[PDB]
Scaffold this active site. Structure first.
Site, PDB file in Angstrom:
ATOM      1  N   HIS B  49       0.822  -1.224   0.000  1.00 31.34           N
ATOM      2  CA  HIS B  49       0.000   0.000   0.000  1.00 31.34           C
ATOM      3  C   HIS B  49       0.847   1.262   0.000  1.00 31.34           C
ATOM      4  O   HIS B  49       1.966   1.194   0.451  1.00 31.34           O
ATOM      5  CB  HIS B  49      -0.855   0.065   1.252  1.00 31.34           C
ATOM      6  CG  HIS B  49      -1.434  -1.254   1.663  1.00 31.34           C
ATOM      7  ND1 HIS B  49      -1.266  -1.766   2.936  1.00 31.34           N
ATOM      8  CD2 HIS B  49      -2.190  -2.158   0.972  1.00 31.34           C
ATOM      9  CE1 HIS B  49      -1.890  -2.932   3.005  1.00 31.34           C
ATOM     10  NE2 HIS B  49      -2.469  -3.191   1.834  1.00 31.34           N
ATOM     11  N   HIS B  51       1.277   4.456   2.071  1.00 31.92           N
ATOM     12  CA  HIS B  51       0.868   4.954   3.365  1.00 31.92           C
ATOM     13  C   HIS B  51       1.024   6.500   3.342  1.00 31.92           C
ATOM     14  O   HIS B  51       1.665   7.086   2.461  1.00 31.92           O
ATOM     15  CB  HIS B  51       1.653   4.244   4.487  1.00 31.92           C
ATOM     16  CG  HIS B  51       1.189   2.838   4.778  1.00 31.92           C
ATOM     17  ND1 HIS B  51       1.055   2.355   6.056  1.00 31.92           N
ATOM     18  CD2 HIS B  51       0.863   1.808   3.969  1.00 31.92           C
ATOM     19  CE1 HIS B  51       0.681   1.092   6.020  1.00 31.92           C
ATOM     20  NE2 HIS B  51       0.534   0.735   4.758  1.00 31.92           N
ATOM     21  N   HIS B  66      -3.061   4.066   5.715  1.00 35.86           N
ATOM     22  CA  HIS B  66      -3.139   4.042   4.282  1.00 35.86           C
ATOM     23  C   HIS B  66      -3.450   5.454   3.802  1.00 35.86           C
ATOM     24  O   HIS B  66      -4.295   6.144   4.402  1.00 35.86           O
ATOM     25  CB  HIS B  66      -4.166   2.981   3.797  1.00 35.86           C
ATOM     26  CG  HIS B  66      -3.759   1.558   4.078  1.00 35.86           C
ATOM     27  ND1 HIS B  66      -4.597   0.489   3.854  1.00 35.86           N
ATOM     28  CD2 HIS B  66      -2.583   1.053   4.572  1.00 35.86           C
ATOM     29  CE1 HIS B  66      -3.922  -0.621   4.199  1.00 35.86           C
ATOM     30  NE2 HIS B  66      -2.669  -0.314   4.575  1.00 35.86           N
ATOM     31  N   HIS B  74     -11.225   0.867   3.544  1.00 33.72           N
ATOM     32  CA  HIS B  74     -10.247   0.044   2.881  1.00 33.72           C
ATOM     33  C   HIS B  74     -10.966  -0.819   1.908  1.00 33.72           C
ATOM     34  O   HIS B  74     -11.969  -1.396   2.244  1.00 33.72           O
ATOM     35  CB  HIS B  74      -9.480  -0.846   3.903  1.00 33.72           C
ATOM     36  CG  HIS B  74      -8.438  -1.688   3.262  1.00 33.72           C
ATOM     37  ND1 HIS B  74      -7.236  -1.162   2.816  1.00 33.72           N
ATOM     38  CD2 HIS B  74      -8.411  -3.012   2.972  1.00 33.72           C
ATOM     39  CE1 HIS B  74      -6.528  -2.130   2.248  1.00 33.72           C
ATOM     40  NE2 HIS B  74      -7.213  -3.257   2.327  1.00 33.72           N
ATOM     41  N   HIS B  83      -9.246   3.096  -0.226  1.00 28.96           N
ATOM     42  CA  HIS B  83      -8.270   4.198  -0.034  1.00 28.96           C
ATOM     43  C   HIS B  83      -7.525   4.437  -1.339  1.00 28.96           C
ATOM     44  O   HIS B  83      -7.387   3.532  -2.086  1.00 28.96           O
ATOM     45  CB  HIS B  83      -7.282   3.811   1.056  1.00 28.96           C
ATOM     46  CG  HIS B  83      -7.929   3.485   2.375  1.00 28.96           C
ATOM     47  ND1 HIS B  83      -7.502   2.446   3.190  1.00 28.96           N
ATOM     48  CD2 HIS B  83      -8.960   4.087   3.034  1.00 28.96           C
ATOM     49  CE1 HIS B  83      -8.222   2.441   4.299  1.00 28.96           C
ATOM     50  NE2 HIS B  83      -9.130   3.408   4.219  1.00 28.96           N
ATOM     51  N   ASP B  86      -4.604   1.843  -1.666  1.00 30.14           N
ATOM     52  CA  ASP B  86      -4.863   0.413  -1.636  1.00 30.14           C
ATOM     53  C   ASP B  86      -4.430  -0.132  -2.972  1.00 30.14           C
ATOM     54  O   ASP B  86      -5.249  -0.188  -3.877  1.00 30.14           O
ATOM     55  CB  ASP B  86      -6.376   0.164  -1.480  1.00 30.14           C
ATOM     56  CG  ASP B  86      -6.886   0.494  -0.060  1.00 30.14           C
ATOM     57  OD1 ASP B  86      -6.065   0.730   0.813  1.00 30.14           O
ATOM     58  OD2 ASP B  86      -8.097   0.509   0.184  1.00 30.14           O
ATOM     59  N   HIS B 123       3.683  -5.630   3.438  1.00 30.39           N
ATOM     60  CA  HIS B 123       3.205  -6.179   4.686  1.00 30.39           C
ATOM     61  C   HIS B 123       3.483  -7.639   4.813  1.00 30.39           C
ATOM     62  O   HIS B 123       3.776  -8.323   3.805  1.00 30.39           O
ATOM     63  CB  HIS B 123       1.671  -5.952   4.729  1.00 30.39           C
ATOM     64  CG  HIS B 123       1.308  -4.526   4.878  1.00 30.39           C
ATOM     65  ND1 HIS B 123       1.301  -3.898   6.102  1.00 30.39           N
ATOM     66  CD2 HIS B 123       0.951  -3.597   3.966  1.00 30.39           C
ATOM     67  CE1 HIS B 123       0.927  -2.642   5.932  1.00 30.39           C
ATOM     68  NE2 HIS B 123       0.683  -2.434   4.649  1.00 30.39           N
ATOM     69  N   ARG B 146       4.646  -4.707   9.161  1.00 30.56           N
ATOM     70  CA  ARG B 146       5.189  -4.013   8.020  1.00 30.56           C
ATOM     71  C   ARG B 146       6.570  -4.565   7.788  1.00 30.56           C
ATOM     72  O   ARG B 146       7.408  -4.425   8.631  1.00 30.56           O
ATOM     73  CB  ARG B 146       5.246  -2.525   8.358  1.00 30.56           C
ATOM     74  CG  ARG B 146       3.824  -1.967   8.631  1.00 30.56           C
ATOM     75  CD  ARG B 146       3.788  -0.476   8.749  1.00 30.56           C
ATOM     76  NE  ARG B 146       2.430  -0.102   9.095  1.00 30.56           N
ATOM     77  CZ  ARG B 146       1.956   1.133   9.239  1.00 30.56           C
ATOM     78  NH1 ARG B 146       2.727   2.204   9.066  1.00 30.56           N
ATOM     79  NH2 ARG B 146       0.681   1.288   9.569  1.00 30.56           N
TER      80      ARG B 146
HETATM   81 CU   LIG Z   1      -0.717  -0.897   4.696  1.00 36.68          CU
HETATM   82 ZN   LIG Z   2      -6.378   0.718   2.870  1.00 35.63          ZN
END
Ligand SMILES: [Cu+2]
Ligand SMILES: [Zn+2]
Ligand SMILES: *[C@@H]1O[C@H](CO)[C@@H](O[C@@H]2O[C@H](CO)[C@@H](O[C@@H]3O[C@H](CO)[C@@H](O)[C@H](O)[C@@H]3O)[C@H](O)[C@H]2NC(C)=O)[C@H](O)[C@H]1NC(C)=O
Ligand SMILES: *[C@@H]1O[C@H](CO)[C@@H](O[C@@H]2O[C@H](CO)[C@@H](O)[C@H](O)[C@H]2NC(C)=O)[C@H](O)[C@H]1NC(C)=O
Ligand SMILES: [Cu+2]
Ligand SMILES: [Zn+2]
Lengths: 152, 155
Positions: B49, B51, B66, B74, B83, B86, B123, B146
């Site tokens: 993602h 961030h 995010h 999400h 988001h 995403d 992730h 993460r």
């Molecule tokens: Cu994330």
């Molecule tokens: Zn998200």
């Protein structure tokens, strides 16, 4: 909402530091930070053009220079936007940065977000020596650490 | 001087175990082609993602949540309710290598969906696209911790 604050993190086997940039005054940026890991002395500190770390510090390009000027001292009219001069490491190999600059910005053509901060192996001579490199790089030597300037 | 060249961006992941380059290039009608390669995780799928913050001062946590300028939930990258950050999951092969190659219509290189100066975060597990029953699903996709991050810089 353009950002009000940015940060670059330096992180190496020998060097660790955070450098923050906060948009202040009459179009001015307040640069604050602390670094450890170099012996006492002065070390070239610049915003380089590219935030590309895929070839390490070398792929960050040269000093950020949208106005196509020559290398100088941050107080000069004739300087690169990314010329922030030298940082100073004290006797405990610690550097505090606290300066104010009016060329770099957090947005627009002088925007530095996405770009790299590079800490150099030796002192920047501000474009004022006979040395061959003086007018482009300040003869500050190799790149010891860099970090992309990210939104804070 | 050859041809002039449009804006691109790039993030580098670099850990003891994980390495990669991810490149972002604007294509037709303002979408972004994301491509690159990451090595270092076993075959499987893993949340990937943008961030909100490009702040690596506290490692991957300080990148924030995010990137979500529209305040949605999400979702799946093919959903409207997602988001902007995403991008979905990336897939690793039996050789612990992931080829990324996708076009995204929410992220941009400028404007209020602009991701330059933001962070890409890989992730530890798969993004469940907000479709499960786990308490984090509609916020994070339950993708867990993460494993690597990089600031998105101007290439
Ligand atoms: Cu994330
Ligand atoms: Zn998200
Ligand atoms: C993505 O990041 C990698 C980081 O290394 C860059 O790719 C290149 O990796 C190769 C593979 O080892 C390196 O070049 C090598 O040179 C030796 C000769 O010394 C040769 O025997 C190998 O086969 C190989 O070709 C090198 O570190 C690096 N090359 C570069 C800087 O072009 C790559 O630049 C990144 N890609 C992007 C963002 O476009
Ligand atoms: C860079 O920032 C990191 C993250 O904030 C620093 O580690 C924190 O530093 C602050 C103050 O120095 C302390 O309050 C904490 O110990 C750390 N974080 C937390 C969450 O407790 C690091 O010290 C900074 N590096 C430098 C040299 O400025
Ligand atoms: Cu330099
Ligand atoms: Zn310069």
């Amino acid at each position: 909402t353009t950002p009000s604050r940015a940060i670059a993190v330096l992180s190496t086997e020998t060097i660790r530091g955070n450098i923050t940039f906060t948009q202040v005054q009459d179009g001015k940026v307040h640069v604050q930070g602390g670094i450890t890991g170099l012996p006492p002395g002065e070390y070239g500190f610049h915003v380089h053009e590219k935030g590309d770390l895929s070839g390490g510090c070398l792929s960050t390009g040269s000093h950020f220079n949208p106005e196509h000027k020559d290398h100088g001292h941050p107080n000069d009219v004739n300087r690169h936007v990314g010329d922030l001069g030298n940082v100073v490491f004290d006797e405990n190999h610690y550097s505090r940065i606290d300066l104010v600059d009016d060329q770099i910005s957090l947005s627009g053509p002088h925007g530095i977000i996405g770009r790299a901060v590079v800490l150099h192996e030796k002192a920047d001579d501000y474009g004022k020596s006979d040395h061959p490199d003086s007018r482009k790089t300040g003869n500050a030597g190799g790149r010891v650490a860099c970090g992309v300037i990210g939104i804070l």
